[PDB]
Amino acid sequence: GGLTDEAALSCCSDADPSTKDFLLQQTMLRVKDPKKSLDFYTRVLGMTLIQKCDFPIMKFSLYFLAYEDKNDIPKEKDEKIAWALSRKATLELTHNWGTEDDETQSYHNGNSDPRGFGHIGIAVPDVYSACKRFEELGVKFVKKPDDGKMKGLAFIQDPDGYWIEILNPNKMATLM
Amino acid sequence: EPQPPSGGLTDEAALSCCSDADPSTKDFLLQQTMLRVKDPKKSLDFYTRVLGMTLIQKCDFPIMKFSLYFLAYEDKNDIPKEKDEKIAWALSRKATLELTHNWGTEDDETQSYHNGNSDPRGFGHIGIAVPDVYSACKRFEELGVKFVKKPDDGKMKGLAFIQDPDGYWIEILNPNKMATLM
Numbered sequence: 001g002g003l004t005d006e007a008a009l010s011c012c013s014d015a016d017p018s019t020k021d022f023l024l025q026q027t028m029l030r031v032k033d034p035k036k037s038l039d040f041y042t043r044v045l046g047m048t049l050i051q052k053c054d055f056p057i058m059k060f061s062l063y064f065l066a067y068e069d070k071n072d073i074p075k076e077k078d079e080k081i082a083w084a085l086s087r088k089a090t091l092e093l094t095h096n097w098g099t100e101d102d103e104t105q106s107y108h109n110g111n112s113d114p115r116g117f118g119h120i121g122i123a124v125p126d127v128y129s130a131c132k133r134f135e136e137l138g139v140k141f142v143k144k145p146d147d148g149k150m151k152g153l154a155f156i157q158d159p160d161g162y163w164i165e166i167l168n169p170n171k172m173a174t175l176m
Numbered sequence: 177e178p179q180p181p182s183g184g185l186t187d188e189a190a191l192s193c194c195s196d197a198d199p200s201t202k203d204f205l206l207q208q209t210m211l212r213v214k215d216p217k218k219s220l221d222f223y224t225r226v227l228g229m230t231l232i233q234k235c236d237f238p239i240m241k242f243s244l245y246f247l248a249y250e251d252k253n254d255i256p257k258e259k260d261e262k263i264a265w266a267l268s269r270k271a272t273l274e275l276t277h278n279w280g281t282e283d284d285e286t287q288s289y290h291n292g293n294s295d296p297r298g299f300g301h302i303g304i305a306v307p308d309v310y311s312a313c314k315r316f317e318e319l320g321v322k323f324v325k326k327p328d329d330g331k332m333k334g335l336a337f338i339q340d341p342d343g344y345w346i347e348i349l350n351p352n353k354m355a356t357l358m
């Protein structure tokens with residue numbers, strides 16, 4: 001069986017004062033082709049590319065996507081990195097150079113053997129209107145809002161096949 | 177001297193693939209990152225005691241034999257007591273971690289999840305911004321935390337990777353001391 005609410009609470013500790021300003025800054029996913037991924041995250045999902053970092057010595061690039069206003073991105077280089085890497089809730093897309101030209105290469109989404117990571121999730125004001133727009137855009141669905149047991153909750157996929165949950169926080173309590 | 181090769185995209189080519197955010201997406205937020213955890217007792221102790229996150233919501237689904245534990249950097253005094261209000265508040269917080277416990281995994285010694293950092297790769301890590309990478313890592317060392325990369329080991333100094341009980345990687349970074357690494 002699972003843990004009781006009390007058994008879970010007993011495993012939790014209060015926050016040490018040295019961690020009081022820590023923030024959950026990024027989730028990193030590797031992407032085969034950044035051209036496809038940037039188009040999906042910006043045009044389809046509405047995120048903004050807030051920082052791009054190239055590491056020629058190590059043959060990779062990092063793309064930082066976030067729900068931020070493009071006009072808040074600083075003009076100066078060093079000021080840019082400090083601002084982008086201090087935003088909460090960013091998505092870091094790692095492009096290992098050359099994967100886009102390797103026809104046999106693909107990344108694993110974590111939802112089949114071996115499992116681990118499952119998904120990222122976007123909270124939206126209306127799951128149905130968001131998903132009607134995704135359908136019009138040709139987005140691939142793992143779960144349409146009214147498919148299966150949990151109504152009003154969807155899973156779409158990005159170009160690498162990573163799962164993205166689409167949820168409305170105000171319509172979740174009814175699923176319990 | 178000759179310069180190292182320049183692969184991938186230029187800044188301008190990357191921006192050629194970016195479109196302005198559609199106004200219908202104006203209120204969207206990146207709410208959660210889901211990771212499967214073998215033993216929620218160990219994971220809750222790690223994320224709360226070591227990292228200072230708070231358990232904001234616990235969901236149990238007996239028919240499906242799993243539980244969800246939502247962790248976030250939120251004040252515990254902001255957690256509503258009433259069930260419906262609590263769910264709406266927790267699931268509307270930005271930057272939460274959803275830990276999935278498939279019941280029974282904690283009893284199976286031969287069971288473990290994949291961290292995405294060995295074949296087959298995909299997900300890499302979550303990352304926490306801190307005021308001081310060095311003092312945070314000194315404390316993690318005192319607490320017996322497993323490291324992937326100490327701050328001054330490897331190519332990029334002042335950036336660390338630790339691991340949680342399932343072996344997922346967690347980057348520890350100070351955004352004010354990253355620009356000097358370029």
Ligand SMILES: CS(=O)(=O)Nc1cccc(-c2cc(-c3ccccc3)cc(=O)n2O)c1
Pocket residue numbers: 118121150165172173175176208210235242244263274276
């Ligand atoms: C066991 S699994 O790995 O297949 N995952 C899974 C399956 C079904 C629903 C949800 C889910 C529910 C909920 C939820 C539903 C109702 C109330 C609160 C949370 C939140 C959420 O983020 N997710 O992903 C998660």
Ligand SMILES: CS(=O)(=O)Nc1cccc(-c2cc(-c3ccccc3)cc(=O)n2O)c1
Pocket residue numbers: 026028053060062081092094300303332335347354355357358
């Ligand atoms: C390419 S990889 O799969 O091996 N991952 C990886 C390894 C080491 C560091 C970084 C990193 C750097 C930086 C960074 C460093 C300096 C300046 C700007 C960003 C940010 C960041 O989030 N990460 O993860 C990423």
Ligand SMILES: [Zn+2]
Pocket residue numbers: 026028092301303347
């Ligand atoms: Zn990172």
Ligand SMILES: [Zn+2]
Pocket residue numbers: 119121165208210274
């Ligand atoms: Zn989820």
